[PDB]
Amino acid sequence: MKSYRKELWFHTKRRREFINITPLLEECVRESGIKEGLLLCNAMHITASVFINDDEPGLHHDFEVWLEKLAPEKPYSQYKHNDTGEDNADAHLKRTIMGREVVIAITDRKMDLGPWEQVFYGEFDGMRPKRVLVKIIGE
Amino acid sequence: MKSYRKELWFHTKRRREFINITPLLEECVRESGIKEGLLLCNAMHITASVFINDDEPGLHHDFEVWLEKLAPEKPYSQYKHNDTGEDNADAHLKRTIMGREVVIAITDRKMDLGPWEQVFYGEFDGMRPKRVLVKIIGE
Amino acid sequence: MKSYRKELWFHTKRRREFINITPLLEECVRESGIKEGLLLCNAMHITASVFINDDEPGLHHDFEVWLEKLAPEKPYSQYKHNDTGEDNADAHLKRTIMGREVVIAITDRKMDLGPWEQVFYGEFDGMRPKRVLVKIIGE
Ligand code: NA
Ligand code: NA
Ligand code: NA
């Protein structure tokens, strides 16, 4: 059985950002040499996400607005997690909505994706070095 | 290592629908011949879901009402994704709540499920041909 | 190919509870003897979750408050699922937010986790025996 592992690192300019990581995953799959298998890609931090959706700026804006509605950043005081000086309680909630991980089929050496599937890193508490894990198993 | 792949296609009569796909997955598992492994089942479209929950009509109604509360279809104008004539922004949000995928253990040639687990395709922007992927790896 | 399976059982004192199960998963991984692979851990019941986040009491409180906002338990009458005497409709919704499952990479005989990742059983309709499945495949 083959396995492959890679950490992808991010340090976003702002607190929140969506980053299309599809091409990075494509290169992981390619270098793994795995023909058939499963790929896991997950945020290694509990204030960020890996998810699949559209790469369209309007929709990215809509996710920002929606996540702020469902899990508002402010006031910081509304969250007990922030009681001793942290301010990232909302990021733990936002990541929960978008999800921690994707699992993607590898078929004939490629990610087995639909026409509009793109993989994103969803940063909700950035401006510091954070990590995504790619793990592939198969043959 | 064995692997198995199947696309399951749907064309729903209405915009939104839940479809119990458990029996289809059972037939995938059976024909794969895999005894022990992991099964991924995911929506290949970014406006639909695969999830596990109850097959009970009251609950299906409750999910419809709840998803409309969390991610209302209308007005279309509230979403920037819809600015150039699409109207499916809400479906990208609804699918995010329900999830893209399930991963299910295969044990002794069967899906390793609890007593009430049923697998659903959650269509949020239907009336067109859309796809679910089943991928199984193991031995 | 190696595979490993274990059911972990819970019977919570109260309706809702978060339980850190990370050490149990560590022991599964250890006893499996698997060096490289993927671990699935999922709630086998459709009113509970397995998820990864912080083990911090303030945040646990915040999740409780947030989930009650997004998917209120009461009044029971607001949910059609509860129409014939059940009262757990909200638990099916809450679990949907937190998620059914985690998938975790196994690397060099260990769960491949970031610095603050902890795995939780999220019980939303407890006080009865319920189950989590751990399944590991790899070599
Ligand atoms: Na935090
Ligand atoms: Na769209
Ligand atoms: Na129920």
UniProtKB/TrEMBL annotation, chains A, B, C:
<dbReference type="InterPro" id="IPR035917">
    <property type="entry name" value="YjbQ-like_sf"/>
</dbReference>
<dbReference type="Pfam" id="PF01894">
    <property type="entry name" value="YjbQ"/>
</dbReference>
<protein>
    <submittedName>
        <fullName>Uncharacterized protein</fullName>
    </submittedName>
</protein>
<dbReference type="InterPro" id="IPR001602">
    <property type="entry name" value="UPF0047_YjbQ-like"/>
</dbReference>
